[PDB]
UniProtKB/Swiss-Prot annotation:
Reaction equations catalysed: Hydrolysis of (1->4)-beta-linkages between N-acetylmuramic acid and N-acetyl-D-glucosamine residues in a peptidoglycan and between N-acetyl-D-glucosamine residues in chitodextrins
Localization, UniProt: Secreted
Active site residues according to the UniProt entry: E35, D52
A biological process term (GO) from this entry: defense response to bacterium
GO molecular function, one term: identical protein binding
Additional observations: Lysozyme C is capable of both hydrolysis and transglycosylation; it also shows a slight esterase activity. It acts rapidly on both peptide-substituted and unsubstituted peptidoglycan, and slowly on chitin oligosaccharides.
EC category: hydrolase
Protein name: Lysozyme C
Protein encoded by which gene: LYZ
Record EC number: 3.2.1.17
Lineage: Eukaryota, Metazoa, Chordata, Craniata, Vertebrata
Length: 129
């Protein structure tokens, strides 16, 4: 599923992300935009053999099991495939775990380089929230 900007904003808001660990809604929407272009089915393979999955491009070496990443942790205790669903519940619950680990949203490369220090508030412009 390819989410609309406002649509996603609303879905994240209802799932508890507006201001989760001090990160405003604009941050999450912006991160999703640059990570997967709002596509829940997005996948990307990395040099270390791990793969990034879904709307938040969650990594298989740390957060989910895809049965193909060698010496992997499955911190969210979930098959990576579960993160490619139209229902973002899995992704958001995993994200909550990630953002609370110590590097905050810096865990999202796209976020660090294209969202951090920008006016993320623009991402929720015109939304009915
Ligand atoms: C969205 C996504 O998957 N992004 C990937 C990042 O998760 C990943 O970064 C690494 O995250 C792990 C777990 O949060 C970092 O580990 C922990 O670091 C904290 C303090 O920084 C410490 O308290 C924990 O002991 C330690 N956990 C373990 C089990 O070691 C790790 O430092 C992050 N890596 C770096 C270089 O900062 C990166 C890298 O695989 O990929 C993103 O795609």
């Amino acid at each position: 599923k390819v989410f609309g900007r406002c649509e996603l904003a609303a879905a994240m808001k209802r799932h508890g992300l507006d201001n989760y660990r001090g990160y405003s809604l604009g941050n999450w929407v912006c991160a999703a935009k640059f990570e997967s272009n709002f596509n829940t089915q997005a996948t990307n393979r990395n040099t270390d053999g791990s793969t990034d999955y879904g709307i938040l491009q969650i990594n298989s070496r740390w957060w989910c099991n895809d049965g193909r990443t060698p010496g992997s942790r499955n911190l969210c205790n979930i098959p990576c495939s579960a993160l490619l669903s139209s229902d973002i519940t899995a992704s958001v619950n995993c994200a909550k775990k990630i953002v609370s680990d110590g590097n905050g949203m810096n865990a999202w490369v796209a976020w660090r380089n294209r969202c951090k220090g920008t006016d993320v508030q623009a991402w929720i412009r015109g939304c009915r929230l």
